[PDB]
Amino acid sequence: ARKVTTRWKITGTLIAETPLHIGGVGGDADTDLALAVNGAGEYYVPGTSLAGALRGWMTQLLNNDESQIKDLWGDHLDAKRGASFVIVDDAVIHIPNNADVEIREGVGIDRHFGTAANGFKYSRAVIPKGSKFKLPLTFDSQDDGLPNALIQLLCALEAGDIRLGAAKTRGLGRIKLDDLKLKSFALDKPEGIFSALLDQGKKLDWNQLKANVTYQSPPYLGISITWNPKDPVMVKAEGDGLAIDILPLVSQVGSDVRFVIPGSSIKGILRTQAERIIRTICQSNGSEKNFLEQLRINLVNELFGSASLSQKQNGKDIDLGKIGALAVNDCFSSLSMTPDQWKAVENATEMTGNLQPALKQATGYPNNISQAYKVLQPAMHVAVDRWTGGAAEGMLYSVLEPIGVTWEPIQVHLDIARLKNYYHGKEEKLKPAIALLLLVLRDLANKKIPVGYGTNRGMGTITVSQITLNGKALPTELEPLNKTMTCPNLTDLDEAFRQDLSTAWKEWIADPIDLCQQ
Amino acid sequence: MRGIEITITMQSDWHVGTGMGRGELDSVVQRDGDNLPYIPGKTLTGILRDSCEQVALGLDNGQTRGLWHGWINFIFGDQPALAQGAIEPEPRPALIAIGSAHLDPKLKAAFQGKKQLQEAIAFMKPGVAIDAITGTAKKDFLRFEEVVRLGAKLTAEVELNLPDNLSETNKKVIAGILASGAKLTERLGGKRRRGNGRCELKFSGYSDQQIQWLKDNYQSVDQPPKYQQNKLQSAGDNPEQQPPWHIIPLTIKTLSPVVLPARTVGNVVECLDYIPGRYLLGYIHKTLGEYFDVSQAIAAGDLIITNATIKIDGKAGRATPFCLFGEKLDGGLGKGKGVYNRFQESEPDGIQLKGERGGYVGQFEQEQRNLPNTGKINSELFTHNTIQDDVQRPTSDVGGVYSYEAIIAGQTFVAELRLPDSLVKQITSKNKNWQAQLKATIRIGQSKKDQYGKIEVTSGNSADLPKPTGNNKTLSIWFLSDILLRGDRLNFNATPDDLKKYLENALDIKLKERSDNDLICIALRSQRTESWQVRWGLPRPSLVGWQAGSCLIYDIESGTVNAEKLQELMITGIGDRCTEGYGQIGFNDPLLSASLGKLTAKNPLPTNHPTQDYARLIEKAAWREAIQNKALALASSRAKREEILGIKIMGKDSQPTMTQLGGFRSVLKRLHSRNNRDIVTGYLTALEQVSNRKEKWSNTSQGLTKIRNLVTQENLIWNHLDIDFSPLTITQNGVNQLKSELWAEAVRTLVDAIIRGHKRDLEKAQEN
Amino acid sequence: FSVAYTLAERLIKSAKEVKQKVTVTNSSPITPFPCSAIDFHILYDSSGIDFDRIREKLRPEDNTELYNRPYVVTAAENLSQAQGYEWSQAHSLQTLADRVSYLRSEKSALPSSQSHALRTALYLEKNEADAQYSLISQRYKILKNFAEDGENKSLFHLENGKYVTRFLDALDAKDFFANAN
């Protein structure tokens, strides 16, 4: 056979730290994008999808060196490499308790009219959060010990730095490894081959290898925004309720339901303001473009990403698509409910009847409707007919306004390494994208970006009390980003840095080239 | 010997065996004769060998050649295609034969004729390659692969033909290695490294006790014993042959594909469409060699085993006579009309004929009034690879890929064993029930130990001797085997004049070629056969002759032919190596005298069955996709949408508005089970209790009650779908349970399809 | 090359079936009318390397076949005096070349996204292939050209009792119709 000095069984629990979507061929009559299922119909991570997740990350770690990658992941064409030395099995996903798959609604909002673009209405089945699956990894070593690149990979898994599945920038795909175990079998020797057959291997202390190494986390900037809703903030639930027509969106977060602001939603509002800034400077209109064309404007194509779209340039064929360097994570409330407490609200039928206990229960104030309704408040609304007054026939509707729901910080993740690759390594080309992002954050802090449903209709205004910029391995001129800002107008960043960004920003405004074309 | 099995439990979805894809698939798994997925015995041998190579490589302390690698070459045989230079020892064959792992026989029977279910055993896995800098799908790199559902338990027959002298210690070494390498096997097939093909592989009777013995004893183990052939031993004690000749017809049925090498050229072996008798000489030595000296009988010419040719009309199909010519545009035996025996019929006006060149014709009497039945032998190409063990993928150094044509399973062939009365006396004096010993199951051919070659042999009753007619005017000859005359210089370059001289001498009659100018008189083709002799370890010489089917007819100029002698030559054959089946003649056959141009041709699984769980996964898949496809069809017509939900178009208008349908459809998303039909009935009563919302649904064809019914009458979704689920179920009580299981999904699926087909028909009326 | 050439020796017989579907009018014996035709494959290795197996994987249902691939290349005007003229038009290579042009024509006039939805549907029964097409036919007006029913509601046409289509041939040949002219 292939010689194996030592075989390693590497295993542990991978937890969805955000929702997850590995897609099958697509579409189950309940979702336009349907989760991948094994032959038993169980939700699973294809070992292909995890192998490429871990190989892909390793490719960025190792500066896209083909040699060491193919040394561990095999190669079809080298005459001495062939099959992979890392085996990745298919891993079934255990959704916590037996929580069902969530369906997540999606819409594209026309940048001219500010409303749902026609056709751009979709839904994605997503694995909840808290869901667990096995890390099914085996490594056949021909060298002695365990590769540094493979130790670095396992460090990134425990750091939660690898992302899996679809929609990685739009909320999804974060996994974390826990309870990593290493079993070693010296298949080169009699005692180790029999141990493979009988004894389940020598346990290695991961903490020993974890001490021998420093985790080489790639360049990234992380933005964490602390917001409290000023006006109620909520994404609309997928369909009208009984006692309340318009209910907040919830997600399963372990064994409990929490109010969620999808990262798809925070990313679309940030993208919308980012694009509006760019178009405002260039005085570039969006009314004649269709929605896919409206999205495709400079700097946001790199930051927020662009659709895959192969185009013949001239003989050469180029993908216009790139993943977003900017990734936003779903936001969740401080406020959780048991999965049935919320069903008590969704299935309430009378606003002054059984809804009152349901909200008293779910808010945690079973005996204070006043305190309960300072958290979740039902609001009736009328359309008033313009000749008669009174109310228009049929136009009576109710919102469950989460007036006092408290939220977790919004967490944005800028892959500086991904941007730098788009800019072909040129760290000087980062400054306009950074300048744009800080301008978008200045607007977010100044209440210029409302979030969620009903922003024009009494909801969606947020107060931003802190923004914490916390990058790692940033290029030396971007290091003044490492700041906790509390002034909305960025004046906590050093003026010499804000002037340097402003200079590069103004240089780009003067000639707004496609900054990743070279 | 028999009794060992390999049990394979597939623990992840699995892909094997083929470099081809179907309509929506770019890689399709390999499928047995039942069209069911299976693990080919060459894949299973190769996988199990590799895992034994790992164990041996560990026991050798990582030495690539050593004591325990010798044991692998003992058990699995040497690999002479790798070794190079002057390797002196003859290559050992394997001690282990490993069949193909097939699905449970009763489960396989449940599938028969259920084409839709056979497809549901496997599904598309998506595959895409992502660009490392953009993080997006690469161009070109999008594939869809067929994968077979996990949970499949497959079993392969295994045979261990251990040497007779092998010690009990060495037996336990072989058991230990095989038990070890089986337990070390965790993957098989394609993309093993990326999830696929995870398995448990177990031998029957090799528990971990066999591994534990090896652990306790591996240090005491010597080199394997030296291999030697089972040589032949001749008693010499046979009687002289005495008439009559008994004829013992042997039916051969192929139970796995059989490779019978015609042309071995490069990386492909082409296959015969008949079994030569030489393949059965080993089975004759086994079963009968205890009764008489089979080797002396072969030497004396006291034994014939004919070729096993395809069974037609309950008899051995006869090689299509080359005197038959078809109309080149609109005739021949495959068309079933327009066949002329050019020995007797002139070529028609205008139409040019082509010779018949192959296949087998059935029986034909002198007044058949029909063309003879034509038997065709089904054969399939099987493709294999060799893996270079350090890169773990095929390479040019190992030859990459090779193919065998094989006669597929289920084919039925008839041979005849002919023996003189003196030997049949000898046998019957030693066993009166001796034809019962001719029932056997044997492996013949190329690659006979693994995936190929399994045949059942069954004897009939003693057949009648041939009855050639001693026509004094003309004699015809039909070749039913390949005639191997030697020239006068003992090489095989004989000519038709050598055959004329041969028959003239044998029958004591002078012959002359018939001169009728419109009629052909000789229709031979030559044949050259290249074969190996397993007892020589060298190829046979090359045997040149004329093909089966070759024909000729002579005018008998003087002398009188004896039907007793024609019969004798119709039993013993003429020329070289008639004991193997060469030389088989047909004399004065009707089909060569006749004129033909005017003629024409004429269960569900037991509920407790262990594969019931796995079968139920196949059922849901077949049901789900059936429901989906039918929902598409039903939604494609506006009359069926109005029947099922009352939804209709009124010009530009939709009844109700799409917003009202969206409200319903958003509630139906909550119909996960029939315990949630109260959710939809809650919505409908609230809708009905509000007058303005109820009026929104007037001018529907009673849509609110149609929705109430579909949600609350469990049979009604199935009435609308009207799928016949009998071709889609194999579990007993499958229909009742799957209807109870898939109800809510079927309701959701149909309404979703209807509302989509409604909106897209509305767009045709609305968008003008 | 060997496998590819034995395919060609089978493809040449499939093209050479024009010899008896297009025939000299009032001939006796029925002579072929001189007619030129192509059959082509595009192996990918996936289709089965044997022609008989290749075509039965594109006949997904007993009345439905997803290939029109013996294409006459002789001009219609030259064929008009033969028997079997109507067949030669349905099998005219220009019908394939036109449909390929519509696929190539442009962003894509027919999105590959939607071509492949139709491609997938073709392996279903006609009632499901036509259902998918009816979900699409008026979103992409170019599809009025890819229809073959004469109704603009199906990709199939009836030929000697078989539903046959050029659409999946046009997807195959979409990139094998290039010329320096």
Side-chain angles (χ1 to χ4, degrees):
Chain A
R2 181 184 260 187
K3 194 167 181 176
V4 178
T5 285
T6 290
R7 174 171 286 173
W8 292 87
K9 294 230 185 161
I10 298 140
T11 195
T13 300
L14 292 168
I15 310 88
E17 291 301 331
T18 60
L20 254 169
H21 182 94
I22 301 77
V25 184
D28 287 345
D30 288 345
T31 58
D32 304 303
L33 299 119
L35 289 164
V37 292
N38 69 5
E42 303 168 300
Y43 300 118
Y44 87 133
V45 185
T48 47
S49 72
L50 183 63
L54 304 183
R55 176 175 183 151
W57 183 92
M58 260 183 56
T59 304
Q60 297 294 83
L61 170 79
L62 304 177
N63 314 309
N64 317 78
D65 173 33
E66 305 92 339
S67 64
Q68 287 163 101
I69 296 295
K70 296 174 170 202
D71 288 354
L72 282 99
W73 298 94
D75 192 22
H76 50 319
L77 309 163
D78 186 22
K80 295 188 178 180
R81 275 184 276 218
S84 175
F85 289 87
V86 193
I87 300 140
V88 201
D89 301 305
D90 291 340
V92 162
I93 299 171
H94 303 298
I95 311 194
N97 68 97
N98 293 300
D100 184 29
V101 174
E102 293 177 350
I103 292 82
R104 277 280 185 85
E105 297 293 330
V107 76
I109 300 299
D110 188 295
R111 301 298 192 245
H112 185 244
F113 303 99
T115 67
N118 289 337
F120 293 88
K121 174 67 254 287
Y122 65 93
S123 62
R124 186 185 296 278
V126 307
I127 293 280
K129 154 180 174 164
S131 302
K132 297 181 177 176
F133 60 103
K134 187 173 179 171
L135 176 66
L137 290 174
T138 329
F139 178 66
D140 283 314
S141 201
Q142 297 200 318
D143 42 309
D144 197 11
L146 190 69
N148 185 288
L150 189 50
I151 295 167
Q152 294 289 352
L153 180 78
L154 295 169
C155 293
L157 286 171
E158 288 208 317
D161 289 344
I162 303 190
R163 295 208 179 207
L164 184 67
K168 287 178 292 302
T169 60
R170 327 183 289 260
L172 270 45
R174 193 187 177 202
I175 62 171
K176 191 210 181 286
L177 177 63
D178 288 325
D179 304 354
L180 175 61
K181 293 161 287 176
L182 304 175
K183 297 305 188 80
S184 173
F185 310 90
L187 300 200
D188 219 26
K189 300 184 182 171
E191 305 86 350
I193 192 66
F194 288 123
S195 181
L197 296 167
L198 296 168
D199 306 334
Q200 299 187 11
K202 182 183 292 186
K203 175 67 178 293
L204 180 61
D205 292 337
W206 172 236
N207 297 75
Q208 189 171 355
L209 297 189
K210 193 63 167 69
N212 288 357
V213 85
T214 298
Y215 174 40
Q216 187 177 354
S217 59
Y220 84 90
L221 173 69
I223 316 111
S224 64
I225 306 129
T226 301
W227 62 290
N228 54 90
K230 177 66 166 291
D231 293 301
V233 166
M234 65 159 259
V235 171
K236 211 216 173 188
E238 67 292 323
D240 291 4
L242 297 182
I244 295 289
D245 303 286
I246 295 139
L247 287 165
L249 188 68
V250 278
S251 252
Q252 294 273 4
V253 182
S255 62
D256 268 20
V257 283
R258 288 185 175 271
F259 288 120
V260 66
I261 301 278
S264 284
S265 282
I266 315 152
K267 190 187 186 201
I269 69 183
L270 294 175
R271 186 186 183 115
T272 296
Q273 192 67 10
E275 292 171 29
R276 184 180 296 134
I277 290 164
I278 297 288
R279 287 191 285 257
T280 296
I281 283 164
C282 306
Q283 298 281 54
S284 179
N285 201 297
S287 60
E288 75 290 337
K289 292 179 180 75
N290 69 82
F291 176 73
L292 287 175
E293 263 62 73
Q294 288 174 343
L295 289 173
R296 207 192 304 107
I297 80 174
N298 284 334
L299 301 180
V300 305
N301 294 332
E302 307 98 276
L303 282 169
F304 297 96
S306 51
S308 286
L309 172 57
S310 52
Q311 297 289 23
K312 295 279 288 187
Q313 185 173 21
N314 183 19
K316 182 181 182 176
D317 188 341
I318 55 169
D319 191 17
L320 277 51
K322 69 205 72 184
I323 194 165
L326 195 155
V328 203
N329 280 1
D330 307 17
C331 187
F332 280 111
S333 39
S334 289
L335 177 64
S336 73
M337 298 153 286
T338 70
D340 44 84
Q341 277 171 344
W342 185 246
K343 255 52 182 162
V345 186
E346 298 201 308
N347 266 74
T349 54
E350 295 299 328
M351 177 180 290
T352 58
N354 53 20
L355 183 76
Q356 281 179 3
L359 291 174
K360 280 190 291 181
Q361 292 281 357
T363 60
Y365 293 97
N367 306 89
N368 282 304
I369 187 172
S370 60
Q371 303 297 356
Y373 285 5
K374 286 172 174 178
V375 178
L376 294 175
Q377 193 168 97
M380 274 288 192
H381 300 145
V382 282
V384 177
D385 171 280
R386 295 294 190 260
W387 292 261
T388 60
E393 187 74 5
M395 308 302 168
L396 180 61
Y397 64 107
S398 59
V399 187
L400 187 72
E401 294 193 340
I403 183 61
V405 174
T406 286
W407 294 85
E408 94 183 3
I410 301 168
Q411 300 281 337
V412 187
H413 177 252
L414 176 68
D415 192 339
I416 295 290
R418 185 54 57 59
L419 275 187
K420 188 178 175 185
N421 294 11
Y422 300 146
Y423 306 144
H424 305 288
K426 297 183 180 287
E427 307 88 346
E428 186 172 16
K429 267 67 185 177
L430 292 167
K431 298 184 182 182
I434 303 302
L436 176 66
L437 179 57
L438 284 169
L439 294 170
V440 178
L441 296 170
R442 190 172 74 193
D443 284 359
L444 189 71
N446 278 281
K447 314 190 294 191
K448 277 172 166 282
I449 317 177
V451 53
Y453 194 65
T455 61
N456 262 17
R457 306 191 307 288
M459 290 206 299
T461 321
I462 67 174
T463 301
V464 162
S465 64
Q466 172 180 333
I467 302 184
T468 289
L469 294 157
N470 176 59
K472 305 297 295 187
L474 294 180
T476 54
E477 59 203 316
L478 294 186
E479 198 163 329
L481 290 169
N482 283 339
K483 199 78 71 175
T484 287
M485 310 192 296
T486 61
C487 177
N489 296 342
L490 314 175
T491 69
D492 296 307
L493 289 167
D494 304 33
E495 190 178 43
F497 176 67
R498 284 183 291 127
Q499 191 162 342
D500 183 37
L501 285 188
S502 300
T503 305
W505 181 233
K506 289 180 175 192
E507 288 169 6
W508 187 79
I509 289 170
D511 183 15
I513 57 153
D514 303 24
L515 202 58
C516 53
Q517 188 166 15
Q518 188 160 236
Chain B
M1 77 79 77
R2 198 65 58 69
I4 307 174
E5 296 181 11
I6 283 162
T7 294
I8 314 188
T9 298
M10 304 308 294
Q11 302 190 132
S12 72
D13 305 303
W14 54 280
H15 184 89
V16 175
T18 300
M20 85 186 34
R22 262 186 295 112
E24 52 270 333
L25 299 155
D26 302 278
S27 64
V28 173
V29 310
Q30 239 161 6
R31 280 181 180 259
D32 54 30
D34 309 86
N35 191 249
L36 301 171
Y38 80 125
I39 298 161
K42 300 207 86 164
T43 286
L44 178 62
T45 43
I47 288 295
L48 188 67
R49 187 180 187 130
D50 189 277
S51 302
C52 295
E53 306 238 353
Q54 275 291 357
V55 170
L57 190 56
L59 297 175
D60 275 340
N61 302 85
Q63 300 172 103
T64 61
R65 299 188 183 174
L67 187 137
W68 293 92
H69 277 298
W71 280 101
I72 298 317
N73 292 319
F74 190 60
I75 300 160
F76 299 92
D78 298 290
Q79 307 185 94
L82 302 187
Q84 66 186 1
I87 285 72
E88 286 186 66
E90 300 92 325
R92 289 172 284 197
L95 297 191
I96 199 166
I98 303 181
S100 306
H102 296 282
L103 294 172
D104 168 72
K106 213 175 294 182
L107 182 64
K108 296 185 55 162
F111 281 103
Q112 308 291 17
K114 303 194 182 197
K115 178 57 169 172
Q116 305 81 5
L117 274 175
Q118 298 167 359
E119 305 284 288
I121 324 178
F123 61 102
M124 290 184 285
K125 191 168 180 171
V128 75
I130 281 173
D131 195 291
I133 64 164
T134 73
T136 71
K138 293 184 177 184
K139 195 194 178 183
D140 284 346
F141 288 55
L142 186 63
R143 67 190 181 274
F144 292 99
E145 169 203 54
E146 201 185 14
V147 176
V148 181
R149 299 174 189 288
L150 78 162
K153 186 189 181 180
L154 304 103
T155 182
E157 305 98 306
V158 168
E159 173 167 334
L160 269 177
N161 51 258
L162 304 182
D164 56 4
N165 59 90
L166 189 79
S167 70
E168 274 57 48
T169 290
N170 287 345
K171 288 175 187 173
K172 289 181 185 180
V173 172
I174 295 166
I177 291 164
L178 289 171
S180 302
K183 196 172 184 189
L184 211 80
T185 303
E186 175 91 55
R187 284 152 254 290
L188 63 78
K191 291 224 158 42
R192 301 173 237 182
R193 280 97 187 180
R194 302 296 171 254
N196 284 3
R198 194 184 165 218
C199 60
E200 282 290 352
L201 194 162
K202 291 190 184 182
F203 280 97
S204 63
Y206 293 161
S207 304
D208 307 57
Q209 300 183 4
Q210 311 309 322
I211 310 173
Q212 183 60 62
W213 184 91
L214 200 78
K215 185 179 187 289
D216 294 336
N217 292 271
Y218 79 99
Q219 298 175 17
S220 75
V221 171
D222 296 316
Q223 295 286 356
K226 71 185 181 181
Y227 172 80
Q228 299 190 258
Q229 296 179 17
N230 294 299
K231 291 208 183 150
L232 293 164
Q233 292 177 335
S234 161
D237 206 19
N238 288 357
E240 291 296 339
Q241 63 163 257
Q242 299 172 14
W245 282 78
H246 297 264
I247 300 177
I248 296 99
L250 310 184
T251 300
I252 283 83
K253 187 169 187 173
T254 64
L255 306 179
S256 73
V258 190
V259 183
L260 300 148
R263 276 205 318 156
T264 306
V265 50
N267 81 327
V268 66
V269 179
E270 298 201 327
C271 192
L272 302 176
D273 54 351
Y274 67 99
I275 295 71
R278 83 178 184 268
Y279 290 86
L280 299 163
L281 286 181
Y283 149 86
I284 294 299
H285 264 282
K286 187 183 185 179
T287 59
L288 300 185
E290 67 173 353
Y291 304 127
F292 65 96
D293 188 342
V294 172
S295 76
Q296 184 184 21
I298 288 165
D302 302 349
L303 188 149
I304 291 94
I305 176 60
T306 76
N307 307 331
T309 50
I310 194 72
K311 195 168 180 178
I312 312 170
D313 308 325
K315 295 188 179 66
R318 297 171 299 167
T320 303
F322 292 165
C323 68
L324 303 185
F325 280 67
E327 299 191 5
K328 190 163 186 175
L329 302 183
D330 191 28
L333 292 160
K335 268 56 179 171
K337 65 179 68 183
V339 179
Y340 302 79
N341 173 17
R342 287 298 309 287
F343 285 10
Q344 312 297 350
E345 298 182 280
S346 306
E347 185 158 34
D349 296 342
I351 290 82
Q352 78 286 16
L353 301 177
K354 64 174 184 176
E356 301 292 0
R357 309 184 187 102
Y360 293 83
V361 292
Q363 291 296 318
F364 188 97
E365 301 207 331
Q366 74 176 357
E367 193 169 4
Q368 189 71 12
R369 298 292 183 168
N370 294 271
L371 295 180
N373 291 321
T374 296
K376 70 189 296 185
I377 295 85
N378 301 302
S379 177
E380 189 54 80
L381 192 79
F382 297 83
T383 305
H384 300 290
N385 70 33
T386 307
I387 301 294
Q388 188 189 300
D389 320 76
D390 59 348
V391 300
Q392 285 288 307
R393 45 162 189 96
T395 68
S396 192
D397 317 71
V398 296
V401 312
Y402 62 97
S403 295
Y404 300 150
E405 290 184 337
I407 296 185
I408 67 170
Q411 305 292 120
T412 307
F413 300 80
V414 181
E416 286 174 339
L417 170 74
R418 323 194 199 289
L419 294 170
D421 179 60
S422 60
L423 291 188
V424 171
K425 276 168 168 163
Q426 188 83 331
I427 303 155
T428 53
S429 76
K430 293 191 177 190
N431 184 352
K432 281 80 178 183
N433 309 299
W434 74 272
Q435 292 185 1
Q437 314 317 307
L438 299 176
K439 191 188 184 181
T441 300
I442 64 176
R443 286 170 170 276
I444 66 153
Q446 183 98 86
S447 200
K448 76 184 66 70
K449 68 155 178 33
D450 40 60
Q451 176 170 337
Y452 299 105
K454 194 187 175 194
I455 66 166
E456 184 205 296
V457 194
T458 293
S459 186
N461 298 293
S462 296
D464 296 331
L465 283 70
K467 55 179 66 175
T469 293
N471 184 326
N472 286 298
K473 304 305 299 184
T474 56
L475 175 71
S476 64
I477 315 105
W478 177 354
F479 291 168
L480 303 157
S481 197
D482 306 63
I483 319 298
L484 306 181
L485 295 190
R486 295 173 184 261
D488 57 340
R489 305 177 192 102
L490 304 177
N491 50 2
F492 287 104
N493 69 353
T495 67
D497 296 304
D498 302 289
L499 180 61
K500 189 193 294 170
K501 281 174 176 184
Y502 187 108
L503 295 170
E504 166 176 332
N505 181 43
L507 297 169
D508 193 24
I509 59 184
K510 185 173 291 188
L511 300 173
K512 187 175 182 184
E513 62 193 307
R514 69 181 294 191
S515 57
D516 303 306
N517 308 87
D518 290 9
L519 307 185
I520 75 181
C521 168
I522 299 182
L524 313 186
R525 299 180 213 275
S526 64
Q527 182 84 72
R528 175 166 158 158
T529 296
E530 309 285 15
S531 178
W532 197 268
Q533 173 144 0
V534 181
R535 303 194 186 278
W536 289 4
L538 290 175
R540 297 173 77 178
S542 191
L543 306 176
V544 190
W546 299 294
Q547 296 184 29
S550 300
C551 292
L552 69 176
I553 183 166
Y554 288 111
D555 189 4
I556 300 169
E557 285 283 65
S558 63
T560 174
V561 75
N562 186 358
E564 304 153 7
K565 192 66 174 185
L566 294 172
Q567 176 190 273
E568 171 181 307
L569 295 182
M570 260 198 83
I571 277 158
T572 59
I574 62 167
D576 214 53
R577 291 174 224 247
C578 296
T579 291
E580 292 163 70
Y582 293 108
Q584 299 296 315
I585 294 169
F587 273 133
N588 285 329
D589 191 77
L591 187 55
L592 295 174
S593 301
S595 300
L596 274 66
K598 304 302 177 66
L599 309 185
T600 64
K602 288 168 61 73
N603 275 287
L605 291 177
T607 60
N608 68 321
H609 193 67
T611 78
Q612 184 254 111
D613 287 340
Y614 184 61
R616 179 54 57 77
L617 281 311
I618 322 309
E619 288 182 312
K620 288 188 73 173
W623 277 51
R624 281 175 158 147
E625 89 96 31
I627 292 158
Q628 290 163 11
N629 295 352
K630 190 56 172 285
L632 256 165
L634 289 171
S636 77
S637 74
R638 78 212 318 268
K640 282 296 178 182
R641 292 193 297 273
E642 193 182 337
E643 183 178 27
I644 298 161
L645 299 187
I647 266 55
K648 59 171 172 174
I649 303 291
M650 300 211 303
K652 267 64 180 177
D653 305 315
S654 178
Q655 265 56 52
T657 63
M658 290 301 315
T659 299
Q660 292 293 318
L661 295 174
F664 167 49
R665 186 168 156 263
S666 304
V667 171
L668 203 76
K669 256 68 188 294
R670 305 187 67 200
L671 188 70
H672 298 295
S673 158
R674 59 172 168 283
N675 81 280
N676 311 125
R677 71 172 46 134
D678 195 19
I679 307 302
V680 194
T681 297
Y683 169 81
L684 290 159
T685 53
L687 165 47
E688 178 172 39
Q689 285 164 358
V690 183
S691 177
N692 296 318
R693 314 215 301 126
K694 193 181 184 187
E695 293 177 350
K696 238 69 178 59
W697 286 77
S698 73
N699 307 321
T700 62
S701 174
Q702 309 302 331
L704 292 188
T705 65
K706 281 179 175 165
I707 296 164
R708 188 71 62 102
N709 296 349
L710 187 66
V711 166
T712 60
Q713 296 177 15
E714 195 173 36
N715 304 291
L716 184 60
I717 183 56
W718 308 119
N719 293 359
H720 291 311
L721 285 173
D722 206 10
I723 303 158
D724 179 10
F725 298 109
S726 316
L728 309 176
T729 191
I730 35 173
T731 304
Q732 175 182 348
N733 305 324
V735 182
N736 296 341
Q737 293 177 356
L738 290 161
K739 283 187 172 175
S740 85
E741 174 77 322
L742 298 176
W743 174 82
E745 184 170 344
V747 174
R748 283 184 272 116
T749 300
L750 185 57
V751 171
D752 181 73
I754 281 173
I755 293 177
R756 187 179 296 99
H758 177 50
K759 210 270 170 169
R760 299 205 189 197
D761 279 350
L762 178 63
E763 285 172 6
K764 300 184 186 76
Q766 187 183 265
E767 312 313 320
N768 293 335
Chain C
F1 165 75
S2 51
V3 177
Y5 182 80
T6 188
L7 234 177
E9 287 269 53
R10 267 90 284 284
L11 270 25
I12 189 68
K13 292 178 68 182
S14 312
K16 197 152 56 170
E17 85 181 45
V18 297
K19 182 173 63 176
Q20 291 290 280
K21 284 192 179 170
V22 191
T23 50
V24 176
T25 309
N26 311 334
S27 59
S28 284
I30 301 173
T31 52
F33 185 82
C35 182
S36 301
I38 284 173
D39 200 332
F40 71 92
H41 180 43
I42 313 155
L43 204 28
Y44 289 114
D45 203 28
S46 113
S47 305
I49 74 256
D50 180 7
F51 178 84
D52 193 6
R53 284 68 171 198
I54 282 165
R55 294 288 153 102
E56 61 118 10
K57 311 223 299 194
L58 286 173
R59 194 180 304 122
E61 293 300 337
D62 303 22
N63 72 356
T64 287
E65 73 195 344
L66 309 187
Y67 66 92
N68 197 106
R69 213 163 294 195
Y71 285 103
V72 178
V73 325
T74 302
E77 285 74 14
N78 297 128
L79 294 156
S80 65
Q81 67 191 94
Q83 295 166 340
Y85 176 56
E86 74 300 295
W87 177 89
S88 311
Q89 293 313 110
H91 280 274
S92 280
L93 183 61
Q94 190 62 51
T95 67
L96 179 67
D98 289 343
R99 288 162 187 261
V100 165
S101 304
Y102 303 145
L103 293 168
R104 294 196 78 75
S105 77
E106 290 190 346
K107 77 299 302 181
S108 310
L110 182 60
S112 300
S113 173
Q114 304 303 331
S115 300
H116 290 128
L118 293 172
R119 168 168 134 155
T120 303
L122 290 191
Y123 301 106
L124 314 179
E125 186 55 295
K126 180 177 169 296
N127 298 1
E128 291 110 43
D130 295 357
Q132 265 268 9
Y133 181 91
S134 301
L135 261 50
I136 302 174
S137 65
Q138 290 256 112
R139 288 188 171 210
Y140 307 98
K141 301 300 188 77
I142 195 75
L143 287 176
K144 292 182 179 185
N145 303 320
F146 291 105
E148 308 180 23
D149 50 7
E151 305 292 352
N152 304 357
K153 57 179 63 174
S154 184
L155 297 170
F156 294 92
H157 73 275
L158 187 72
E159 186 87 59
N160 197 19
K162 277 71 178 176
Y163 296 121
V164 58
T165 183
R166 300 178 280 255
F167 184 79
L168 193 65
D169 298 343
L171 292 174
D172 283 352
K174 190 185 71 172
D175 290 298
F176 302 83
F177 267 119
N179 198 330
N181 298 343

